[PDB]
Design a binder for this molecule. Structure first.
Ligand code: HEM
Ligand SMILES: [Mg+2]
Length: 386
């Protein structure tokens, strides 16, 4: 705990002042859990691109199956796996996915506009539409959305460095649920092939480029990333529009401002706080040398609030230089988000659909949260459109 008390409710609600104290006093902090925590932008940016840091040799504990996915592999296995999916998430591919996302979003807003204008924008929009888009990509009908959201969040608790024993058991149970669910999806597609990403994983398996477990857990990974951080971008952006009507107006009236707005939502409340790596050689980080064999937590959320890069960093300003494009919310280096183009498209579709159809959005109740040391989480976001 000490300077980063992961399970403390105050820290989870607002960790930014804790990051600021670390940046000032301990840029490389040896945390009691056995992590070296790295809080400055300059150091995070260099390390996340350093090819000597490993994910494959990290102990993921109950989340070990992530080692059967690109997220849990070092090169060359990383390259092998990532090359299978690269063509599915290019700007060209995203043009197709955008039509699906747009239709889903527009259908939700049609129900809203025909009713009383109220919506839980979390379960009823950001989750629903990102999940349905992911299922279209895979080539399946949408089912088990609630379980998939819940069990992804459960796994997230163990990926956070504050995870405990009870959370670990729920995590292994979640992976068993996912593997059973996904094996049925794959069996169905072997029996009746389509043209979706699941079909592409099956083809890769049949060509000897992936194992059966790599197929199953890679589908898991895309279920999780297809909705988890992107729904926070959407949720937090909608919440900001309820608080800041000038942001609603700018999104609608200034198309050139839109990347800057997306970027500033991501910078101010980074959906995933950190990425973890293992050193494989003595690693110099400023005035500290970390031995080989040590786990590093690269605090992207702290980097994103570092005043050496972002002036007045705790203030939301969508008009920042270079559209706030220096943020590290999508990571960087070998593992830099494979879904960035899709995520930015999905968020843009939601925000543009809202501001082109309604005059404003307001809160219709108190939001609910489930923040952790690792994940920012809006669980319920009751709004009214007009
Ligand atoms: C705002 C939304 C998102 C944010 C902030 C985000 C952030 C990140 C970050 C920080 C990582 C790096 C993890 C590391 O270095 O350990 C990552 C990896 C990845 N993300 Fe995203 N992500 C988002 C949306 C998506 C979406 C919609 C997809 C869907 C394809 C996706 C797919 C991935 C994949 C597959 C990886 C692993 C890449 C690799 O290991 O080479 N992400 N994401
Ligand atoms: Mg329509």
């Amino acid at each position: 705990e000490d300077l980063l008390p992961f399970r403390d409710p105050g820290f989870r609600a607002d960790p930014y002042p804790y990051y600021a104290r670390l940046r000032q006093e301990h840029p490389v902090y040896r945390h009691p859990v056995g992590l070296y925590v790295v809080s400055h932008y300059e150091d995070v940016a260099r390390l996340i691109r350093n090819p000597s840091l490993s994910v494959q040799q990290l102990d993921f504990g109950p989340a070990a199956p992530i080692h059967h996915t690109m997220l849990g592999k070092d090169a060359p296995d990383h390259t092998r796996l990532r090359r299978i999916t690269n063509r599915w998430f290019t700007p060209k591919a995203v043009e197709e996915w955008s039509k699906v996302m747009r239709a889903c979003v527009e259908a939700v807003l049609d129900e809203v506009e025909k009713g009383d204008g109220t919506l839980d924008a979390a379960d009823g929009l950001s989750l629903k539409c990102t999940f349905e888009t992911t299922c279209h990509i895979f080539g399946i009908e949408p089912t088990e959305m609630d379980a998939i959201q819940r069990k992804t969040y459960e796994i997230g608790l163990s990926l956070g460095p504050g995870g405990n024993d009870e959370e670990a058991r729920a995590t292994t149970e979640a992976f068993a649920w996912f593997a059973e669910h996904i094996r049925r999806l794959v069996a169905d597609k072997r029996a009746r092939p389509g043209e979706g990403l699941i079909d592409a994983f099956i083809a890769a398996q049949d060509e000897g480029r992936m194992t059966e477990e790599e197929v199953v857990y890679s589908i898991f990974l895309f279920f999780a990333v297809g909705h988890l951080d992107v729904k926070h971008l959407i949720n937090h952006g909608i919440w900001l529009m309820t608080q800041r009507p000038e942001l609603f107006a700018a999104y609608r009236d200034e198309p050139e401002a839109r990347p800057g707005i997306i970027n500033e939502i991501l910078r101010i409340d980074t959906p995933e706080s950190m990425v973890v790596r293992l050193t494989t050689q003595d690693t110099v980080i400023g005035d500290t040398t970390v031995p080989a064999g040590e786990a590093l937590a690269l605090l992207i959320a702290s980097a994103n609030r570092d005043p050496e890069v972002f002036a007045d960093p705790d203030t939301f300003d969508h008009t920042r230089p270079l559209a706030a494009s220096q943020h590290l919310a999508f990571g960087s280096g070998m593992h830099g988000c494979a879904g960035q183009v899709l995520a930015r498209a999905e968020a843009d579709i939601v925000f543009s659909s809202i501001v082109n159809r309604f005059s404003g959005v307001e809160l219709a109740g108190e939001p609910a949260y489930a923040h952790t040391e690792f994940l920012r989480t809006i669980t319920h976001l009751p709004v009214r459109f007009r």
